[PDB]
Amino acid sequence: KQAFLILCLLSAAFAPICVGIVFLGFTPDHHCQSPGVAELSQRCGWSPAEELNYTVPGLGPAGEAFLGQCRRYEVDWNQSALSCVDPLASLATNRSHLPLGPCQDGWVYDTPGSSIVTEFNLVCADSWKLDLFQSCLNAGFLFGSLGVGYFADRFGRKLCLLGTVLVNAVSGVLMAFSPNYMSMLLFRLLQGLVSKGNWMAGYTLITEFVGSGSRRTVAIMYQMAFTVGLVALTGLAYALPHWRWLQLAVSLPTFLFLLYYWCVPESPRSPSFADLFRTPRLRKRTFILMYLWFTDSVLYQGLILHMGATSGNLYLDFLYSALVEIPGAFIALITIDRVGRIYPMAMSNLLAGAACLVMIFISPDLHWLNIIIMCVGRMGITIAIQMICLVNAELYPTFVRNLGVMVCSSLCDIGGIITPFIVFRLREVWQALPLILFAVLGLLAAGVTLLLP
Ligand SMILES: COc1ccc([C@@H]2Sc3ccccc3N(CCN(C)C)C(=O)[C@@H]2OC(C)=O)cc1
């Protein structure tokens, strides 16, 4: 067999594109850059933990990290009258009376590597642009979920697949060379236009190469290829501390695999949209399936982004959480053939919602319990997604199955568009608000799931 390994490699290469923002876009601690502070520190011998205390504005009640991240004291540090023990005491009687200003002179990031945030200065006022990086990719997924069918209708299937692979590889390689943010967003959108199209085309091909009597195992293996790709992305991210190097090391393997994938012997081998709603039972099924797809995509992406934004040891937490899918995949494989798909999916959704709810009250120092809860939630959502990827095949007849899959999977992309703004922006108002929303969505999805036959 040759198609199996190469198609699993193709599926594994989709993971760094989808969840790569966790390592390409990490946000280190930062503060306003102020000239003259370096020379004063050299004169006074200030350690980094001492300079970060003397100059950068301190934390207020309940944290309030904004005053240090986006503001600075407008004081002429060049004056020699400043005391080496404490320069702020010679300025004014009260520290709160000193003038305040934005980071006009730049930023200082406490990290040896770099990311898009550290290079394009997507912090404070510009910090809302980081969500746009994922939103553009999800918009590309949404557009490719509808344009790829027409493209493959007007063009040869294998040639269209080859063209999409080539375009994806070229776009991924080109992104690492972007000189500014707008061009990078253009390449991100172009890559997202073809990434999900390639994934679905590979799914269809791998389900065609094996008869309908064994599609489950094939689909589960294709899914676990994504977990293998996540593990490889974690390894590469640990090895390479800069985002351009990681982008090259991610995109290049696909292009080189294209050089080896010229031709293989097994390669060359109307329903109406209104029909889904004219009948009450099918309308109910379509509504429930759309809601479940949206909720599961929101929960999965939100959990990964929250882990990326809040975990204190990102590499090990990502490595642990990624490995839990494989036991989840095996659990799903055992469960489907024995006790059906409805109850297991409902229980997985309930477990995910409960895990989201419990995680709110955990103190920050209990990292060993927080990671266990995160792993449980990830296993729950993984099992739920595995179940829902197979239930759709039964409720829809072959006459309208492909249209139903295309329609239902389109809401996942809208959820992907909405999700970054929920995770990143609502966290400003209250750190527990995204967790509350995720818990509510998970519990509601668990409740509604019982209605499916
Ligand atoms: C009918 O066949 C399909 C297959 C896959 C999907 C999307 S593709 C996607 C895009 C971005 C992030 C994750 C995913 N994964 C992969 C999940 N991993 C555990 C493998 C899904 O399963 C998505 O569906 C969801 C979210 O429920 C839709 C329809």
- Tell whether 146 is covered by a domain: yes
Mutate to test the pocket of ligand 1, among 303, 409, 413, 419 (most ligand atoms within 8 A of CB): 409
291/414 same-domain check:
yes
368/235 same-domain check:
no
**162 and 202 in contact (C-beta within 8 Å)?**
no
**Token representation of residue 355:** 């895990």
Task: Sort strands 72-73 and 100-101 into parallel, antiparallel or unpaired.
Answer: antiparallel
Which letter does DSSP use for residue 77 in this model? T
Q: Which of 219, 234, 269 is the last residue of a domain?
A: 269
- Tell whether 114 is covered by a domain: no
Mutate to test the pocket of ligand 1, among 288, 300, 392 (most ligand atoms within 8 A of CB): 300
**Token representation of residue 181:** 């943010």
To 5 degrees, how large is the angle CA 202–CA 205–CA 210?
130
**Token representation of residue 433:** 């608000």
- Tell whether 121 is covered by a domain: no
**68 and 110 in contact (C-beta within 8 Å)?**
no
**286 and 408 in contact (C-beta within 8 Å)?**
yes
What sign does the CA torsion over 452, 221, 338, 300 have?
negative
**Token representation of residue 70:** 């986006």
Experimental determination technique? cryo-EM
What are the two backbone dihedrals, phi and then psi, of residue 332, each rounded to the nearest 5 degrees?
-65, -40
Q: Which of 51, 83, 109 is the last residue of a domain?
A: 109
285/241 same-domain check:
no
What sign does the CA torsion over 357, 301, 351, 12 have?
negative
101/334 Cα distance (integer angstroms): 61
404/396 Cα distance (integer angstroms): 7
- Tell whether 232 is covered by a domain: yes
- Tell whether 355 is covered by a domain: yes
Q: Count the helices and strands in the chain (H runs, E runs).
A: 20, 4
- Tell whether 54 is covered by a domain: yes
What is residue 31's three-state secondary structure? strand
Residue 115 CA to ligand 1 center (angstroms) comes to 26
444/438 Cα distance (integer angstroms): 10
User: Within 13 Å and on the Cβ side, how many CA atoms surround 285?
Assistant: 22
**Token representation of residue 412:** 């996942």
402/291 same-domain check:
yes
What is residue 281's three-state secondary structure? helix
Q: Give the DSSP H or E segment for 394.
A: helix 367-395
Report the candidate in 167, 196, 145 with the shortest Cα–Cα distance to residue 18: 196
User: CB neighbours (10 Å) of residue 163?
Assistant: 14
Q: How many domains does the chain have?
A: 3
**382 and 324 in contact (C-beta within 8 Å)?**
yes
What is residue 60's three-state secondary structure? strand
Q: Which of 204, 239, 269 is the last residue of a domain?
A: 269
- Domain carrying residue 54: 30-109
**Token representation of residue 251:** 């995109």
Breaks in the chain at C–N > 2.5 Å: after which residues? Answer: 269
Q: Which residues pair with 101 in a beta bridge?
A: 72
User: CB neighbours (10 Å) of residue 388?
Assistant: 22
308/311 Cα distance (integer angstroms): 6
401/391 Cα distance (integer angstroms): 12
**60-88 burial, b if ≥16 CB within 10 A, otherwise e?**
eeeeeeeebbbbbbebebeeeebeeeebe
CB of residue 412 inside a 6 A radius of ligand 1: yes
CA distances from 136 to 143, 169, 406 (A): 11, 18, 20
**25 and 237 in contact (C-beta within 8 Å)?**
no
410/385 same-domain check:
yes
342/353 Cα distance (integer angstroms): 17
- Tell whether 118 is covered by a domain: no
CB of residue 385 inside a 6 A radius of ligand 1: yes
DSSP line for 8-29: HHHHHTTHHHHHTHHHHS----
130/264 same-domain check:
yes
Rg (alpha carbons) of the chain, rounded to whole number: 25
296/364 same-domain check:
yes
What is the distance in angstroms between the CA of the first residue and the CA of the last residue of the chain? 38
Q: Resolution reached, in Å?
A: 3.4
CB of residue 234 inside a 6 A radius of ligand 1: no
**382 and 328 in contact (C-beta within 8 Å)?**
yes
CB of residue 223 inside a 6 A radius of ligand 1: yes
Mutate to test the pocket of ligand 1, among 136, 220, 227, 385 (most ligand atoms within 8 A of CB): 385
- Tell whether 321 is covered by a domain: yes
For position 163, which CATH number holds? Answer: 1.20.1250.20
94/53 same-domain check:
yes
What is residue 107's three-state secondary structure? strand
Q: Give the DSSP H or E segment for 72.
A: strand 72-73
**Token representation of residue 17:** 């594109």
**List of residues 6+ apart from 27 with CB closer than 8 A:** 115, 117, 123, 130, 309
Residue 389 CA to ligand 1 center (angstroms) comes to 8
Which atom of ligand 1 lies at the shortest distance from residue 199's CA? 8
CA distances from 88 to 55, 103, 104, 125 (A): 8, 19, 21, 27
Helix 314-323 to helix 325-339 angle (10° resolution) is 20
User: CB neighbours (10 Å) of residue 233?
Assistant: 25
What are the respective helix, strand and coil percentages of the chain, to the nearest 5?
70, 5, 25
**435 and 335 in contact (C-beta within 8 Å)?**
no
264/282 same-domain check:
no
Which atom of ligand 1 lies at the shortest distance from residue 388's CA? 27
Q: Which residues pair with 31 in a beta bridge?
A: 108
DSSP line for 358-391: HTTS--TT-HHHHHHHHHHHHHHHHHHHHHHHHH
398/400 Cα distance (integer angstroms): 6
CB of residue 69 inside a 6 A radius of ligand 1: no
307/399 same-domain check:
yes
CA 430 from centre of chain: 21
Mutate to test the pocket of ligand 1, among 389, 390, 408 (most ligand atoms within 8 A of CB): 389
CA distances from 43 to 38, 77, 163, 245 (A): 9, 12, 61, 37
Type of residue numbered 52? L
**172 and 15 in contact (C-beta within 8 Å)?**
no
**List of residues 6+ apart from 36 with CB closer than 8 A:** 76, 77, 78
**224 and 326 in contact (C-beta within 8 Å)?**
yes
Closest CA to ligand 1's atom 6: 409
What are the two backbone dihedrals, phi and then psi, of residue 267, each rounded to the nearest 5 degrees?
-75, -50
154/163 Cα distance (integer angstroms): 13
83/66 same-domain check:
yes
321/343 Cα distance (integer angstroms): 24
**362 and 373 in contact (C-beta within 8 Å)?**
yes
102/156 same-domain check:
no
**Token representation of residue 2:** 């040759």
**420 and 131 in contact (C-beta within 8 Å)?**
yes
CB of residue 293 inside a 6 A radius of ligand 1: yes
Report the candidate in 23, 26, 19, 11 with the shortest Cα–Cα distance to residue 245: 23
CA distances from 114 to 23, 119, 233, 242, 321 (A): 10, 7, 17, 5, 24
CA distances from 355 to 350, 372, 412 (A): 9, 10, 22
172/251 Cα distance (integer angstroms): 5
Q: Give the DSSP H or E segment for 96.
A: none
